[PDB]
Amino acid sequence: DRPRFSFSIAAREGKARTGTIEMKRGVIRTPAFMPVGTAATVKALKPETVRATGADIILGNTYHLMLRPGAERIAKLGGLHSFMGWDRPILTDSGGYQVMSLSSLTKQSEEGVTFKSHGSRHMLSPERSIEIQHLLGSDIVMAFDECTPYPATPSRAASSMERSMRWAKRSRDAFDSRKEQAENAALFGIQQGSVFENLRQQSADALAEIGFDGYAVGGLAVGEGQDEMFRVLDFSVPMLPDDKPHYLMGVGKPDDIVGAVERGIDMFDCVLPTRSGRNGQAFTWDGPINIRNARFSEDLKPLDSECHCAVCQKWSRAYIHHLIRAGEILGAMLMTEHNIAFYQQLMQKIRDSISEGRFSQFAQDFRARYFA
Amino acid sequence: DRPRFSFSIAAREGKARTGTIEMKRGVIRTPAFMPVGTAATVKALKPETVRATGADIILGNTYHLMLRPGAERIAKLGGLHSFMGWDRPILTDSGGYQVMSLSSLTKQSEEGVTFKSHGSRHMLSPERSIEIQHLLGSDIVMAFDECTPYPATPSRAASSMERSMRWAKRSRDAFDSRKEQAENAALFGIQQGSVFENLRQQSADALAEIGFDGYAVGGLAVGEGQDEMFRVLDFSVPMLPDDKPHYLMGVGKPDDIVGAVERGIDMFDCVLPTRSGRNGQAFTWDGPINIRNARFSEDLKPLDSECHCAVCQKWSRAYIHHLIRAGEILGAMLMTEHNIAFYQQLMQKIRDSISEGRFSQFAQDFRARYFA
C-alpha cells in the first residue's frame, strides 16, 4: 500500500524536475496540472472524463465549499471524494486567496477572517480552515494564509507575510493535533513576500523551520505579469527545500507553466482551460483560438491537429462553433474536455522531455510554434 | 444490408403493438421514444450517452436548423449525422409545429409560410421543407403541415386540415422527385382534424390515399389535456393503416405514453425529460421529484431506487441537489442522462410486457405506483 506522502524525483534538467508524489489515494506525476473544481465539480465534466484526460489530482476550495453545500454537510455525506465521485487525491486551497479577493466582505484580525455575504457570516482561521479541510477529507491540505494584494509596499508586504507565517505555524499545529488527518493527509505551507527577495527569503526560512510536506509559492498570479512573475520565481523557488514539491498557485497559461517548470515548479492549477473553454477559447499547439469566430463556421478540422482527446477524434471546429454560438451545454462540455486534455498533454510532454534530458529544447520548440 | 424502410409487428395486445423499424442507419425498437435534439444536440448529452441510455433514433427540427446553423451549411459539412456525431436514424419534424407556435412571426398562404425574425425572413413550404430535410440527410422525413391551434372551431379545423392534406400531397411529390432521398429515407404523413372525429377520418383517408411509410397523429399535445387527448386517440389511431408506424408528436409524460401505447401508438418524442431535467425534475417509478427541494439536501439515495443508469449507479440525490442549486452544468448533464434513461427503460418495459402478453397488467401496476 502507498504511504501517506512520498515525493521522489526521477530526473532533472537545470532547475526542472520530474517525478512522483505517492499518496494513499493515488500517484501524482510531476510536473502536475490540477483541474479546478471549486463547487465540488470540475465544471462541465464528469470525474471519469477528468481522469480520462490524464489528471491525477484536482483542486477544491475551502471557502466555496464552506458556503455551499457546507463542510459539515459534506462530512455527514461521507466526504468530498464520495460526494462528487472522484476517488483520487484532492488538494484543497485554504481560503487565503479569498481573504484578499473578497476583502471588502471581510473583517480581518490576527485570529482570522470573518466574511459577510452581500447577509450570513462565515469565519475562517488557521484552525477552522484546517478543520474544514479535514471534514472534506482533503488529501493535500493548504495552510491558511493571506494572498498579499499586488502591488504592495515593502512594509505592507512584510506585515502580511509575517502574519501568514504565524498562521502557518497555527495551521501546522491544528493539522498535527488531529491524528486521523495527520496520518492520512499532507500539509503544504505557502510562501509570501510579494515581489521582494528579502521577504521571500524570510518566508521560506520560516516555512522550512516549521516543516511541511510541500511548499507553495503564493502571492503570484495577482496581476503582476509574466516577466515579473518569472523574476520572482528566479530567486524564490531555490529558497524552498529541494526535496519537496513546489506548487505555483493559480498559474497559468501554457507558456507560464513551461517557464515556471524551467524555474523549478512541480505543481500548477488554473481556471483558464475550464473557464475560457466555456467562453469559446480553445488551446492548440499553434496558440489559442476563439471558436466563436466566423472563420470556424465551416472548418471541418478538429480543434487541434495533433491532440489525442476524444473531442478532436470526433467533432469539427464547425460543430463546436455552432454549439458555443448557440449557448449549448454540449459546447461547454466539449471545449472543456479538449482544453483540460491539452493541458494534460502539455504536462506529459514536459515530464517526458525532462526525463529524456531535452526539456530546454522542448521549451524553445513549444514557444516558437505557440507564438508563431 | 438493411432496407430503406421495413416495419414489422412482432406481438400485439389489444391495440398495443411491439416490433421493429429497419432502416439503412439502424433498427428502431417500437414502441420507441425519441430524445429531442432541436439544435443539432440532445441538450447536455454526448451522442454516445444518448445511445448508452437505449435510444435508437433522435428527433431534429427543420425550422430550427434552417435558422442556425443553416441547412445548406450542414449539407456542405457532410450532413446532420456527421455534423453532430450521431450515426443512427434521425427523424426531422417539418416545421409545421412552428407554423402554429410562431404564427405571429408569419405570413401564411396556400404556397407556404414566411417567418420574420423579431429581422431576417425565412420561408417554408412543402417543397422547401422536404428539401431542407434532404440537405440535413434525415432518415424519417415529416410532411410539411400546420399544427392546428387548440381550441379550434370545426370550420377552422376543417380548413386547416384540408390545407395540410394538400401540403401532404405536395410533400409526397417533392420527396419522390428527389431520387436519392426517395431511395434512402422514409416519409411520414401527419393527420390533422383537431378533436373532431369526422375531420380526423377525412384526414386519415387523404393520407392513406397518398400513401406514406408511417402516419403521425398531429395536432395534439397543444393544451387539450390527457382525457381529451385519449378520447381523440381512441377514434383516431384505428383510422390509420394498421401495418405502418403510428407516431404521436410531442407526447409526453410517462403516463401519457403508457395510455397512448394502449391506444396503438408506436413512436413518441418529448422535451420533458431533457428540459425538465435541467429544471430539476427527475422521473422515478414513484412519480417525479424536484431535486431542488430541501428534503434532498442530505439524501444519499440515487434519483430512483431501481434505475439502471450510470447516474443512479454513482451519484446521490444530495450531490445532484447541490449541483442544480448551484447552477452547475454537471447538474444538467446528470439529470438529463437519468431522465432519458428512465424514459428508455419505460419503453423497454412496455415492449417486453407487450411481447409477453402482460402489458395491461404492466399499465395498471405502473399507474398504481407512479401515482401513489
Ligand SMILES: CC1(C)O[C@H]2[C@@H](O1)[C@@]1(COC(C)(C)O1)O[C@@H]2CNc1nc2cc3nc(N)[nH]c(=O)c3cc2[nH]1
Ligand atoms: C478569480 C479567479 C478565478 O481566480 C484566479 C483567476 O480568476 C485569476 C485572475 O487573474 C488571473 C491571474 C488571470 O487569474 O486569479 C486567480 C489565480 N491566481 C492565484 N490563485 C491563488 C490562490 C492562492 N491561494 C492561497 N491560499 N494563497 C495565495 O497566495 C494564492 C495565490 C493565488 N493566485
Ligand SMILES: CC1(C)O[C@H]2[C@@H](O1)[C@@]1(COC(C)(C)O1)O[C@@H]2CNc1nc2cc3nc(N)[nH]c(=O)c3cc2[nH]1
Ligand atoms: C415549445 C415546446 C418545447 O414544444 C413542445 C412543448 O413545448 C409543449 C408545450 O406544451 C406541452 C404539451 C407540455 O408540450 O408543446 C410541444 C409538444 N407538442 C407537440 N409537438 C408537436 C409537433 C408537431 N409537428 C408537426 N409538424 N405537426 C403537428 O401537428 C405537431 C404537433 C405537436 N404537438
Ligand SMILES: [Cl-]
Ligand atoms: Cl472554471
Ligand SMILES: [Cl-]
Ligand atoms: Cl430540451
Ligand SMILES: [Zn+2]
Ligand atoms: Zn482535443
Ligand SMILES: [Zn+2]
Ligand atoms: Zn437513473
